[PDB]
């Protein structure tokens, strides 16, 4: 329902008592207010309603026990996956299931594994659904789907893995050049091209989801149910200036998403830190990228880089096909000069 | 390869050295030789080969993990096994599975569980097949199919089971009246009858393969695979003569069985208990029938009973249609008036 702005004393007028205990709440100034109340507006309506929500690839080319098992036909082995997998480790648990790591005995090779209760979600048929479509949508730059086990109500999914961890971990224990940044974009905007091409927006791209291989290699993870194999309220730092506007959006939000990944890179910590997740959504929607702490260090390449990544027109803004052709992307090392930063990431981390 | 025999010595000529081996240790005297050479020949034969084998239900009205997923399509519940039942007892292990007992927690009834390695077996087909005929074939009288389920590679498969133990713990603990017994052999005939309706011989009637319940209601089982849901060399007490002279047979071997098993109702153990099995296999094909310890105590109906059943000539012997009409089975007391006695073995059995 409309509600108003009363110009001189910067009090909005007829809003819900939600929008208005989160304004309380948001340490936005009444001079920010006044500045762009539309922006504010916006942002409250996007952290009122945001319960994140589930994402499933419906993009295929009540239920009973021979439907599933219809279903399953084509995806589940025999086989037992707590034989065919050592070293389980239980990396997170929630409403969607269980996750672990695992590795696979005979290959030697890591994986993923999100165990289902069939009979505890009602959505059975998204979930099987997503794993049909998951099994033919394949590609190096993401984790892809592997194998699937029926364990009478428990059905496990297996997706690849990578022994190298986060790219979080890479960023905040070493300080990274830009021609290995260069080439971490490249395999993004690879991941980025291949999924836009198939009518899949990943929405959360950053430094946490981006998985390294030992050798250098990288993939993408959560751009699907069965590829949320990672563990993850907070501010989100990454989301674009039409998404928090909570304006209609396409998959250019995901090269937005890209360039902050970039700034993370180069500072070695996310924007917004310390900041109340409603002032970092007001700040996104208004000032669109945060400001950098060291700028002039930076090329005039990838200077020119983060503008096309982080223009906040939509119409402006690269996609994933242009962004590839982009100089900056010359520079990129190969991938194995990643491997010392792992090892290093790795032995700062113990714990 | 044909072998002879010089009468006055008593000396087989050419026979195998496995048969002569088996010969020396069969404590069958050089009378019974000369006696009847043939039947001797034909047991040496039958013991010597005799690995039991399995028995499969192919009688259905390599393989790949999406043709196992399809066959097993209209079999497989979706559901925890170690979740829908407790009090789990295991009750035996070989190359054919492993076989528990258990109740049901909804209902509250007895089960058994038999445990299939689908990976181990290379006659998967006949597996699943056997499951498939079971499922179809339906019998108050017999152990009937419940429900099966996939835990990986292990396919477990649910018979029906009875709370009251097997017909052997009442036979060796307590006495049987006539009438007992009648109500006994009817039940077993109602089953016979319906397995020789579907091409079906059981082959192994015996009271070990009798299961009572509570309220004193009588299954077979081991009649297929998936029906072997007992613990279980030795003496083959209730083979008919055809069978061990090695002959062609049919299904009124079941009716020779049953008629055996009523003599060790009312003996309370079965015939040639400390015989060697040779001898046993000697004496049932030149005999036919063993010897009753006290023959006088029992009714002239239930002499022409047995008769009926242990008639040697197959075509004098009578089929489980026939014999549901003698006049033996007007004697059946209500199956309820097992109760008693089955609770006194139970009492008697502990350990």
Same mark, same amino acid.
């Given at each position: 329902?409309?509600?108003?702005?009363?110009?001189? $004393?910067?009090?909005?007028?007829?809003?819900?008592?939600?929008?208005?205990?989160?304004?309380?709440?948001?340490?936005? !100034?009444?001079?920010?207010?006044?500045?762009?109340?539309? %922006?504010?507006?916006?942002?409250?309506?996007?952290?009122?309603?945001? &319960? =994140?929500?589930?994402?499933? *690839?419906?993009?295929?080319?009540?239920?009973?026990?021979?439907?599933?098992?219809?279903?399953?036909?084509?995806?589940?082995?025999?086989?037992?996956?707590?034989?065919?997998?050592?070293?389980?480790?239980?990396?997170?648990?929630? +409403?969607?299931?269980?996750?672990?790591?695992?590795?696979?005995? %005979?290959?030697g090779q890591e994986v993923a594994i999100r165990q289902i209760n069939l009979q505890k979600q009602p959505k059975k048929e998204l979930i099987i659904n997503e794993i049909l479509v998951?099994?033919?949508?394949?590609? /190096?730059?993401? =984790?892809?789907?592997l194998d699937s086990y029926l364990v009478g109500d428990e059905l496990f999914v297996v997706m690849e893995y990578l022994a190298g961890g986060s790219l979080t971990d890479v960023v $905040?224990?070493?300080?990274?050049?830009?021609?290995?940044? %260069?080439?971490?974009?490249?395999?993004?905007?690879?991941?980025?091209?291949?999924?836009?091409?198939?009518?899949?927006?990943?929405?959360?791209?950053?430094?946490?989801?981006?998985?390294?291989?030992?050798?250098?290699?990288?993939?993408?993870?959560?751009?699907?149910?069965?590829?949320?194999? &990672?563990?993850? =309220? #907070? !501010?989100?730092?990454?989301?674009?200036?039409?998404?928090?506007?909570?304006?209609?959006?396409?998959?250019? =939000?995901?090269?937005?998403?890209?360039?902050?990944?970039?700034?993370?890179?180069?500072?070695?910590? /996310?924007?917004?830190?310390?900041?109340?997740?409603?002032?970092?959504?007001?700040?996104?929607? $208004?000032? #669109?990228?945060?400001?950098?702490?060291? /700028?002039?260090?930076?090329?005039?390449?990838?200077?020119?880089?983060?503008?096309?990544?982080?223009?906040?027109?939509?119409?402006?803004?690269?996609? +994933?096909?242009?962004? *590839?052709?982009?100089?900056?992307?010359?520079?990129?090392?190969?991938?194995?000069?990643?491997?010392?930063?792992?090892?290093?990431?790795?032995?700062?981390?113990?714990?």
């Amino acid at each position: 329902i409309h509600v108003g702005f009363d110009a001189v $004393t910067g009090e909005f007028t007829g809003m819900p008592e939600q929008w208005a205990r989160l304004l309380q709440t948001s340490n936005i !100034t009444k001079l920010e207010q006044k500045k762009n109340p539309q %922006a504010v507006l916006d942002v409250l309506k996007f952290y009122d309603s945001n &319960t =994140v929500k589930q994402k499933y *690839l419906s993009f295929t080319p009540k239920m009973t026990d021979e439907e599933i098992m219809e279903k399953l036909r084509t995806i589940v082995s025999i086989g037992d996956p707590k034989k065919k997998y050592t070293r389980y480790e239980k990396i997170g648990q929630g +409403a969607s299931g269980t996750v672990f790591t695992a590795t696979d005995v %005979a290959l030697g090779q890591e994986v993923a594994i999100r165990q289902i209760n069939l009979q505890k979600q009602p959505k059975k048929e998204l979930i099987i659904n997503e794993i049909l479509v998951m099994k033919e949508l394949k590609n /190096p730059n993401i =984790v892809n789907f592997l194998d699937s086990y029926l364990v009478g109500d428990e059905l496990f999914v297996v997706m690849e893995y990578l022994a190298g961890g986060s790219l979080t971990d890479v960023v $905040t224990e070493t300080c990274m050049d830009e021609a290995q940044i %260069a080439a971490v974009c490249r395999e993004c905007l690879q991941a980025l091209e291949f999924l836009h091409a198939n009518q899949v927006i990943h929405r959360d791209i950053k430094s946490d989801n981006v998985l390294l291989g030992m050798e250098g290699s990288v993939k993408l993870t959560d751009f699907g149910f069965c590829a949320q194999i &990672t563990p993850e =309220v #907070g !501010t989100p730092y990454w989301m674009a200036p039409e998404v928090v506007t909570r304006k209609a959006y396409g998959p250019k =939000v995901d090269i937005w998403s890209l360039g902050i990944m970039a700034i993370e890179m180069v500072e070695g910590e /996310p924007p917004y830190l310390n900041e109340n997740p409603l002032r970092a959504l007001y700040l996104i929607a $208004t000032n #669109g990228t945060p400001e950098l702490q060291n /700028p002039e260090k930076l090329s005039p390449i990838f200077r020119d880089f983060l503008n096309r990544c982080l223009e906040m027109d939509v119409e402006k803004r690269g996609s +994933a096909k242009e962004l *590839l052709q982009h100089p900056f992307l010359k520079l990129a090392k190969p991938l194995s000069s990643l491997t010392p930063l792992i090892m290093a990431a790795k032995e700062a981390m113990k714990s």
